[PDB]
mmCIF file of C-alpha atoms in Angstrom:
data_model
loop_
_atom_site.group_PDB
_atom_site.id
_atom_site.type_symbol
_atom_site.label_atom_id
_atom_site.label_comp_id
_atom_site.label_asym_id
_atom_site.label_seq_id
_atom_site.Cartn_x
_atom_site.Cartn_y
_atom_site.Cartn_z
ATOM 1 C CA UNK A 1 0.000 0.000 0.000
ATOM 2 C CA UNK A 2 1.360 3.540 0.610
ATOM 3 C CA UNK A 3 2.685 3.438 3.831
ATOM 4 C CA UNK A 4 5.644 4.769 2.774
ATOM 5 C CA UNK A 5 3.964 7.228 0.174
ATOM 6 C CA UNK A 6 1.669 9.373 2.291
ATOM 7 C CA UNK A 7 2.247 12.722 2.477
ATOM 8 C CA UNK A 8 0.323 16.326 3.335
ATOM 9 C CA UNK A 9 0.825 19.199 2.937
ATOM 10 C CA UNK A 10 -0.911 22.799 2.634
ATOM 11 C CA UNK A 11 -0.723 26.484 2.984
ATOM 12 C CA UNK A 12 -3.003 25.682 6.429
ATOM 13 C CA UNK A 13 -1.961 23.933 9.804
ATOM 14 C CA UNK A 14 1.425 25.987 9.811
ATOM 15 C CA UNK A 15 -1.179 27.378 13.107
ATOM 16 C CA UNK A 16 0.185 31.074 14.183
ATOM 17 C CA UNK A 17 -3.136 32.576 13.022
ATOM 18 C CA UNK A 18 -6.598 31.164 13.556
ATOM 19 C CA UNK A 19 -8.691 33.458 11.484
ATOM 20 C CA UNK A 20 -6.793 32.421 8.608
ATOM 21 C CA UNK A 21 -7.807 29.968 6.209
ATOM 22 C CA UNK A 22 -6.655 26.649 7.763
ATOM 23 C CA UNK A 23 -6.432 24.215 4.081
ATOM 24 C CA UNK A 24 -4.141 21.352 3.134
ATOM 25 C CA UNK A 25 -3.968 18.832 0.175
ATOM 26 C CA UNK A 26 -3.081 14.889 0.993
ATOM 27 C CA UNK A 27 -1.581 12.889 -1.572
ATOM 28 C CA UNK A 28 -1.076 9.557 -1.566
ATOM 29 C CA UNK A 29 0.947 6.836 -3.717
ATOM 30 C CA UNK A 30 0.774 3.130 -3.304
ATOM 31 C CA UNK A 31 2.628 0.664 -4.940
ATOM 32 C CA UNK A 32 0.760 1.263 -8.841
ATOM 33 C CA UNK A 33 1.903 4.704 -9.471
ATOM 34 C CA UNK A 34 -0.884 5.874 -8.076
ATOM 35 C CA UNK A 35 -2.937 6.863 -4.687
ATOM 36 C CA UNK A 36 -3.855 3.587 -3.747
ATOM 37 C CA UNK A 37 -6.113 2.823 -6.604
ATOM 38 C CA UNK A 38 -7.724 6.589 -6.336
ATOM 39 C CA UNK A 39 -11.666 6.116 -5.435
ATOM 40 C CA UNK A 40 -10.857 3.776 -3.042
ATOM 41 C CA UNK A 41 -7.564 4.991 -0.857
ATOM 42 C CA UNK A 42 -7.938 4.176 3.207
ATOM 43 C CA UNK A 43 -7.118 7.925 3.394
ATOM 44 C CA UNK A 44 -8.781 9.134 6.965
ATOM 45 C CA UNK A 45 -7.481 12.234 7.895
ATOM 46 C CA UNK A 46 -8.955 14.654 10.544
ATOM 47 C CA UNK A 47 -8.126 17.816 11.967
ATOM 48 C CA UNK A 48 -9.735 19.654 15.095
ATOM 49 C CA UNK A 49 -8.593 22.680 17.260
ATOM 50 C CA UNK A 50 -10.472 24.883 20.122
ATOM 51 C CA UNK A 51 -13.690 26.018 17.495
ATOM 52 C CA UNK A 52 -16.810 25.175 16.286
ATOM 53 C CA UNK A 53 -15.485 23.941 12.639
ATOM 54 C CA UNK A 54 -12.644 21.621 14.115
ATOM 55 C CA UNK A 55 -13.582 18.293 11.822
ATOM 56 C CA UNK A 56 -13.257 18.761 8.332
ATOM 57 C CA UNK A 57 -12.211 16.499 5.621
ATOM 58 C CA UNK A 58 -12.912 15.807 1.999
ATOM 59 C CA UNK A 59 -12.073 13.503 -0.343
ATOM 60 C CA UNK A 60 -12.082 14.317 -3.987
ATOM 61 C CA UNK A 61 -11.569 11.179 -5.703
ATOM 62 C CA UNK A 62 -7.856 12.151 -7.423
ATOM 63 C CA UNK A 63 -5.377 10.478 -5.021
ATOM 64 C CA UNK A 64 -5.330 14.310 -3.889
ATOM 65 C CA UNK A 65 -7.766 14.644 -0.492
ATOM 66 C CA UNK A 66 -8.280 18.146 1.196
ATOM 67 C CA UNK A 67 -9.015 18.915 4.738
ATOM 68 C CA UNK A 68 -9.732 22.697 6.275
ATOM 69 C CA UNK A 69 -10.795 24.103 9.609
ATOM 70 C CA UNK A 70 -11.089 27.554 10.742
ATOM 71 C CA UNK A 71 -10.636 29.053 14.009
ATOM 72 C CA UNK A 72 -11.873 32.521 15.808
ATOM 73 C CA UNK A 73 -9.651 32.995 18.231
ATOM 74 C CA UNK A 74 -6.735 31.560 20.149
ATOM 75 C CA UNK A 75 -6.276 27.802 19.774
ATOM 76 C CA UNK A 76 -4.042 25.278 18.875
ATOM 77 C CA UNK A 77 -4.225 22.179 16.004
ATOM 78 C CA UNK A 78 -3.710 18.551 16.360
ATOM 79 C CA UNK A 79 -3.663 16.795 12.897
ATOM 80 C CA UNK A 80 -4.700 13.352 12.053
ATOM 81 C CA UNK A 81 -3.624 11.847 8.383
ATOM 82 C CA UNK A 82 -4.034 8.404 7.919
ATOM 83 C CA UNK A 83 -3.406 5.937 4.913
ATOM 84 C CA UNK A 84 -2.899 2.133 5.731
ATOM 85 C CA UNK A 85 -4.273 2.569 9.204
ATOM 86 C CA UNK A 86 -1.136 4.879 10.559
ATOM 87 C CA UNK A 87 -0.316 8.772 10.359
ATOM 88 C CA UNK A 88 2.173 10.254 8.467
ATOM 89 C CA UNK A 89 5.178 11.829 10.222
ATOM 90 C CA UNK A 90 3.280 15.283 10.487
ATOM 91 C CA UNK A 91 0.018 15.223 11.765
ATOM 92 C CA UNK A 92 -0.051 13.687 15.031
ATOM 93 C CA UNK A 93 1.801 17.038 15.757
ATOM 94 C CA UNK A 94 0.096 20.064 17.426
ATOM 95 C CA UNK A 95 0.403 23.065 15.337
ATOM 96 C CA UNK A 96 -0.183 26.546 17.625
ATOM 97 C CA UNK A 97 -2.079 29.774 16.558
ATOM 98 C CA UNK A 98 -2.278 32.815 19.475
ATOM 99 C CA UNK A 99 -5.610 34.831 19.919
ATOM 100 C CA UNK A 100 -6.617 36.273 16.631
#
């Protein structure tokens, strides 16, 4: 599979602000040149902070997936990316945004 090949990464979750735009693209590549035979790649990812929007994730059907939350105020962000049933080496991390 692509436990090896998982990777995300996006212009949101770098934290420091929370009323900015919190999105990120996931891309993942198994073993076909591919995501994981795209349509059906065990991508779960998940992010959630101190807000009301904290769980959002998409998939779009590309071997690309996007996620985005989007704070108020001061909080921090604990990522989840998942794609064989583990998390890559960036998103069980706690990214940190100050009071907006």
């Amino acid at each position: 599979a692509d436990p090896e090949k998982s990777y995300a990464e996006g212009p949101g979750l770098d934290g420091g602000e929370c009323f900015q735009p919190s999105k990120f693209k996931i891309h993942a590549v198994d073993p076909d040149g591919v995501h994981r035979t795209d349509g059906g790649d065990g991508f779960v990812v998940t992010i959630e902070g101190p807000a009301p929007v904290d769980p959002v994730m998409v998939d779009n059907g590309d071997g690309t997936y996007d996620v985005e939350f989007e704070p108020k105020e001061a909080g921090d962000y604990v990522i989840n990316l998942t794609l064989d049933g583990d998390n890559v080496n960036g998103f069980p991390k706690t990214v940190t945004v100050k009071p907006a």
